[PDB]
Design a protein around this motif. Sequence first.
Motif, PDB file in Angstrom:
ATOM      1  N   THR A  76       3.191   9.367  -9.257  1.00  0.00           N
ATOM      2  CA  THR A  76       3.027  10.377 -10.292  1.00  0.00           C
ATOM      3  C   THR A  76       4.298  10.928 -10.910  1.00  0.00           C
ATOM      4  O   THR A  76       5.394  10.778 -10.370  1.00  0.00           O
ATOM      5  CB  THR A  76       2.247  11.546  -9.740  1.00  0.00           C
ATOM      6  OG1 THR A  76       2.892  12.008  -8.549  1.00  0.00           O
ATOM      7  CG2 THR A  76       0.841  11.124  -9.407  1.00  0.00           C
ATOM      8  N   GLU A  77       4.105  11.650 -12.008  1.00  0.00           N
ATOM      9  CA  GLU A  77       5.180  12.272 -12.754  1.00  0.00           C
ATOM     10  C   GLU A  77       6.277  12.863 -11.872  1.00  0.00           C
ATOM     11  O   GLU A  77       7.445  12.518 -12.042  1.00  0.00           O
ATOM     12  CB  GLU A  77       4.620  13.360 -13.688  1.00  0.00           C
ATOM     13  CG  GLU A  77       3.738  12.852 -14.821  1.00  0.00           C
ATOM     14  CD  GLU A  77       4.435  11.822 -15.695  1.00  0.00           C
ATOM     15  OE1 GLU A  77       5.478  12.162 -16.305  1.00  0.00           O
ATOM     16  OE2 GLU A  77       3.943  10.671 -15.769  1.00  0.00           O
ATOM     17  N   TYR A 122       6.860  -3.599  -8.503  1.00  0.00           N
ATOM     18  CA  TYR A 122       5.868  -3.852  -9.571  1.00  0.00           C
ATOM     19  C   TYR A 122       4.506  -3.466  -9.037  1.00  0.00           C
ATOM     20  O   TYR A 122       4.295  -3.528  -7.841  1.00  0.00           O
ATOM     21  CB  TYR A 122       5.822  -5.351  -9.908  1.00  0.00           C
ATOM     22  CG  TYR A 122       6.780  -5.823 -10.975  1.00  0.00           C
ATOM     23  CD1 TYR A 122       6.598  -5.447 -12.295  1.00  0.00           C
ATOM     24  CD2 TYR A 122       7.843  -6.676 -10.669  1.00  0.00           C
ATOM     25  CE1 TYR A 122       7.447  -5.899 -13.299  1.00  0.00           C
ATOM     26  CE2 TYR A 122       8.702  -7.139 -11.676  1.00  0.00           C
ATOM     27  CZ  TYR A 122       8.489  -6.742 -12.992  1.00  0.00           C
ATOM     28  OH  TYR A 122       9.288  -7.184 -14.028  1.00  0.00           O
ATOM     29  N   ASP A 123       3.578  -3.055  -9.891  1.00  0.00           N
ATOM     30  CA  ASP A 123       2.216  -2.710  -9.423  1.00  0.00           C
ATOM     31  C   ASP A 123       2.036  -1.603  -8.390  1.00  0.00           C
ATOM     32  O   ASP A 123       1.050  -1.598  -7.625  1.00  0.00           O
ATOM     33  CB  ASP A 123       1.508  -3.937  -8.880  1.00  0.00           C
ATOM     34  CG  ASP A 123       0.884  -4.773  -9.960  1.00  0.00           C
ATOM     35  OD1 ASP A 123       0.086  -4.215 -10.759  1.00  0.00           O
ATOM     36  OD2 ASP A 123       1.178  -5.994  -9.989  1.00  0.00           O
ATOM     37  N   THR A 124       2.972  -0.664  -8.371  1.00  0.00           N
ATOM     38  CA  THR A 124       2.912   0.444  -7.447  1.00  0.00           C
ATOM     39  C   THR A 124       2.658   1.733  -8.255  1.00  0.00           C
ATOM     40  O   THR A 124       3.145   1.896  -9.376  1.00  0.00           O
ATOM     41  CB  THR A 124       4.199   0.464  -6.566  1.00  0.00           C
ATOM     42  OG1 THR A 124       4.155  -0.624  -5.627  1.00  0.00           O
ATOM     43  CG2 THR A 124       4.323   1.763  -5.790  1.00  0.00           C
ATOM     44  N   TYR A 125       1.806   2.597  -7.714  1.00  0.00           N
ATOM     45  CA  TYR A 125       1.450   3.848  -8.371  1.00  0.00           C
ATOM     46  C   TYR A 125       2.119   5.081  -7.782  1.00  0.00           C
ATOM     47  O   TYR A 125       2.157   5.273  -6.561  1.00  0.00           O
ATOM     48  CB  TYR A 125      -0.066   4.046  -8.340  1.00  0.00           C
ATOM     49  CG  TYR A 125      -0.556   5.308  -9.031  1.00  0.00           C
ATOM     50  CD1 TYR A 125      -0.042   5.690 -10.272  1.00  0.00           C
ATOM     51  CD2 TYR A 125      -1.546   6.116  -8.444  1.00  0.00           C
ATOM     52  CE1 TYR A 125      -0.488   6.834 -10.917  1.00  0.00           C
ATOM     53  CE2 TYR A 125      -2.003   7.268  -9.077  1.00  0.00           C
ATOM     54  CZ  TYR A 125      -1.465   7.621 -10.324  1.00  0.00           C
ATOM     55  OH  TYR A 125      -1.891   8.760 -10.989  1.00  0.00           O
ATOM     56  N   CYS A 141       0.819  -1.216   0.000  1.00  0.00           N
ATOM     57  CA  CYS A 141       0.000   0.000   0.000  1.00  0.00           C
ATOM     58  C   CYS A 141       0.855   1.270   0.000  1.00  0.00           C
ATOM     59  O   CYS A 141       0.515   2.279   0.616  1.00  0.00           O
ATOM     60  CB  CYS A 141      -1.000  -0.007   1.166  1.00  0.00           C
ATOM     61  SG  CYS A 141      -2.750  -0.133   0.661  1.00  0.00           S
ATOM     62  N   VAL A 142       1.957   1.189  -0.730  1.00  0.00           N
ATOM     63  CA  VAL A 142       2.919   2.250  -0.887  1.00  0.00           C
ATOM     64  C   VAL A 142       2.476   3.252  -1.985  1.00  0.00           C
ATOM     65  O   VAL A 142       1.776   2.893  -2.941  1.00  0.00           O
ATOM     66  CB  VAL A 142       4.301   1.616  -1.180  1.00  0.00           C
ATOM     67  CG1 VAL A 142       5.311   2.626  -1.684  1.00  0.00           C
ATOM     68  CG2 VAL A 142       4.812   0.964   0.066  1.00  0.00           C
ATOM     69  N   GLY A 143       2.812   4.526  -1.771  1.00  0.00           N
ATOM     70  CA  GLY A 143       2.486   5.594  -2.703  1.00  0.00           C
ATOM     71  C   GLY A 143       3.644   6.576  -2.829  1.00  0.00           C
ATOM     72  O   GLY A 143       4.815   6.229  -2.612  1.00  0.00           O
ATOM     73  N   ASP A 144       3.329   7.829  -3.118  1.00  0.00           N
ATOM     74  CA  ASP A 144       4.381   8.808  -3.282  1.00  0.00           C
ATOM     75  C   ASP A 144       5.298   8.994  -2.069  1.00  0.00           C
ATOM     76  O   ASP A 144       6.498   8.748  -2.152  1.00  0.00           O
ATOM     77  CB  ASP A 144       3.804  10.137  -3.785  1.00  0.00           C
ATOM     78  CG  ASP A 144       3.357  10.072  -5.253  1.00  0.00           C
ATOM     79  OD1 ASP A 144       3.493   9.019  -5.907  1.00  0.00           O
ATOM     80  OD2 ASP A 144       2.881  11.094  -5.770  1.00  0.00           O
ATOM     81  N   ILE A 204      12.744  -1.443 -10.604  1.00  0.00           N
ATOM     82  CA  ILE A 204      11.810  -2.107 -11.530  1.00  0.00           C
ATOM     83  C   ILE A 204      10.336  -2.015 -11.209  1.00  0.00           C
ATOM     84  O   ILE A 204       9.962  -2.033 -10.049  1.00  0.00           O
ATOM     85  CB  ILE A 204      12.178  -3.584 -11.747  1.00  0.00           C
ATOM     86  CG1 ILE A 204      13.689  -3.698 -12.029  1.00  0.00           C
ATOM     87  CG2 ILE A 204      11.362  -4.143 -12.927  1.00  0.00           C
ATOM     88  CD1 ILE A 204      14.235  -5.101 -12.015  1.00  0.00           C
ATOM     89  N   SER A 205       9.523  -1.942 -12.263  1.00  0.00           N
ATOM     90  CA  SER A 205       8.073  -1.808 -12.191  1.00  0.00           C
ATOM     91  C   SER A 205       7.485  -2.124 -13.557  1.00  0.00           C
ATOM     92  O   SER A 205       6.257  -2.322 -13.630  1.00  0.00           O
ATOM     93  CB  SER A 205       7.681  -0.381 -11.773  1.00  0.00           C
ATOM     94  OG  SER A 205       8.395   0.609 -12.506  1.00  0.00           O
TER      95      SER A 205
END
Lengths: 456, 124
Positions: A435-436, A430-433, A404-407, A455-456
């Motif tokens: 932003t720019e 992998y599968d982590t969101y 449940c990792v983010g910025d 990697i992602s």
Amino acid sequence: MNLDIHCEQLSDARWTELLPLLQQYEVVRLDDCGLTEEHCKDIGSALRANPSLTELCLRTNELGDAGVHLVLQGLQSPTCKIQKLSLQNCSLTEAGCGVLPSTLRSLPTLRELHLSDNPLGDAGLRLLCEGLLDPQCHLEKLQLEYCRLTAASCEPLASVLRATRALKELTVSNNDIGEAGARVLGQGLADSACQLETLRLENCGLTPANCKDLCGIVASQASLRELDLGSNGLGDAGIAELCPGLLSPASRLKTLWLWECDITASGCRDLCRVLQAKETLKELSLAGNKLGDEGARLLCESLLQPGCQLESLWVKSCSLTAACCQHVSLMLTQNKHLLELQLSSNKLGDSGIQELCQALSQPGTTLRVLCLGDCEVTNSGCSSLASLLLANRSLRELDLSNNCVGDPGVLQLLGSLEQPGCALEQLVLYDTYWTEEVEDRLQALEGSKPGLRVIS
Amino acid sequence: KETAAAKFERQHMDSSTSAASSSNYCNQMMKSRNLTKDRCKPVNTFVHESLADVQAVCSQKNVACKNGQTNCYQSYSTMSITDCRETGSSKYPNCAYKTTQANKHIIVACEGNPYVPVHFDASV
């Protein structure tokens, strides 16, 4: 030298450009191209005139029963001195298997054969075994996974076995053969002259009963390095029934795969006497099994007996929770032989991660890989991982995908990676969101230290 | 290059099959989409609807993602999807997947304007 179109739907022009080269190439791997019976015609022809080819791989191609027949006939020339042949997922039925006998007769060079994912049915395996017998056939590695082989296929194979002494690798995984067939097979294996190195039997339907029969092979096959038994409800009893042979002084099994086999705490107890006993056991999967925290407590105790020299341990999805980390971590600090740890898909949560981070951040740690994939870690947990990345010197890879990792999480990871003394090499997310803004800092940190991959 | 919108088009779109052919689908796709290149991607989902029927989720229901950020729009239509999931016998380089087909709502994240989708979040 080596042809290798793979996943390219071959243009009729590229196939024609290719053609004359087929008679020159040492290796050809036309995996998943637009290949069909048409191409097979040319492959066949070109196959009979190539004096140097040593491996043909016509993987994932609807070659079919007709197209395989012709390709085969290409190998049927004296000139053909092939040694490895694969026709995985080539849509070959128990019909096209008609030429296997004539074919294995002529190729006493062939050493490796992969027929997996082909609906041979027992009828296909049957004809396959008529070739395997001829004293002009000397295969070493045979792979027959996902072949729709029921137990009927076991006697003729048991038969191929009692006559061979060549085979080093057998893989029949994913065929519903059941308890009866594997016994017919376990029996045959017993009365066989070969020294296997690898034996695989996944989702084959064994039962505790079959372990009793295996107990012999394992205890006696000194050339056996990998024993892959996953996806078979052997449960605790089977395991128990299995150890006598593993303790066998002539067994040097390096890799034991036992995922999703119905083992719980009880069965580890039986396994731990092995780790303590066997300085030869190196890799070992237990993923899926509901070992729980107590199964955990248990394994740890033997990873401390210094005589235990196990390197890679996998407990992906083994019903662990935070309550095992206190033990997991203690082991980690004192153990000088374990290098890889799959703890993924275990509800360790932020709290569990931290004890690890502290344990691991101590001086002299050795774990090089820690996969905390899918363990319920949040932005607030990357803060422990962050301090960890600074103080630990041993870690080369940290998988943390599916959390449940983010910025803010990444950013805290980057703070540590962007520093100078960070020893990490791959950070798997992998599968982590993100932003720019972050992705830029990423493509940016990925600029400063290029020998670090994220990697992602 | 590879714009995060492209990474998405590559990593999660299959407008051609309307449903997964076999139980051997994923093993190929993961391969022909470079998901098993450096290592095996732990999980990945493919959507079987047309792209515009998917790019339209960005002006649909706004939901918070699994990580608490607010730009994740969830679609109304149960779309035809496929869950690729590594198997116990997947020791990279040797990668293996269990294919499960299913029709579900699909939440995804959108970024920028053109408000295109750039990450597959979850199904429901």
